[PDB]
């Protein structure tokens, strides 16, 4: 997989499009908990198909994922919601307006999520740009538990370079990067809400989802 950093970027970009996870169905706070648990599984194998990722030590792979997983989930909801208006596509069969989202026990999260969505709508994000950006957010982790900082930085750099190379086929990359602060704040809001749900103890949550909330 690392050879995708050495050739032309179109090969890298097509690889990222091919390993995009397929549409998920959800089958109403317990619905999202179930759906988010399953998207963590999907996200883990997605990460493994990102060139460079599997060359990190396992414990650093762990640290990255447990600090960015919600950023990747939230960015997926955002790309799926880009063509819609005041609605959030959590799944193929779970589209929700702001009112619909209060009712599924999300409080103000719908508003937070739509703020991200509007910011990406303003950019007219392409599908190619999204998968490079998603990979780049993975690699921009900032976990306190990272051991080989230099290795994570090196992977970050290649993905950033890939975005630059892609955009040159020229202020556009930076515009993309300037939506990352909002992506990370939004993800942290989603996290705080579901950590609150953990404490209530009403809604049952699967092992993996609990483990990632603890981290």
């Amino acid at each position: 997989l690392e050879v995708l950093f050495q050739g032309p970027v179109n090969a890298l970009v097509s690889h990222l499009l091919v390993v995009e996870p397929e549409k998920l169905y959800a089958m109403a706070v317990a619905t999202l908990c179930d759906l988010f648990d399953r998207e963590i599984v999907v996200t883990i194998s997605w990460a493994k198909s990102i060139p460079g990722f599997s060359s990190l030590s396992l414990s650093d792979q762990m640290s990255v994922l447990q600090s960015v997983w919600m950023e990747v989930l939230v960015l997926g909801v955002a790309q799926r919601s880009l063509p819609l208006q005041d609605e959030l596509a959590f799944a193929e069969d779970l589209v929700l307006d702001e009112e619909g989202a209060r009712a599924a026990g999300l409080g103000e999260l719908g508003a937070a999520l739509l703020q991200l969505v509007r910011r990406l709508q303003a950019l007219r994000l392409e599908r190619e740009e999204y998968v490079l950006l998603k990979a780049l957010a993975l690699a921009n982790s900032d976990s306190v538990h990272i051991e080989d900082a230099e290795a994570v930085e090196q992977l970050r750099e290649a993905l950033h370079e890939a975005l630059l190379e892609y955009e040159a086929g020229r202020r556009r990359a930076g515009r993309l990067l300037l939506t990352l602060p909002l992506l990370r704040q939004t993800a942290g809001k989603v996290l705080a809400h579901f950590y609150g749900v953990k404490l209530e103890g009403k809604v049952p949550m699967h092992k993996l989802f609990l483990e990632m909330l603890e981290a």
Partner: peptide
């Protein structure tokens, strides 16, 4: 740990 199991699959 659950995470370790899916990573090392």
């Amino acid at each position: 740990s659950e995470l370790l199991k899916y990573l090392t699959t």
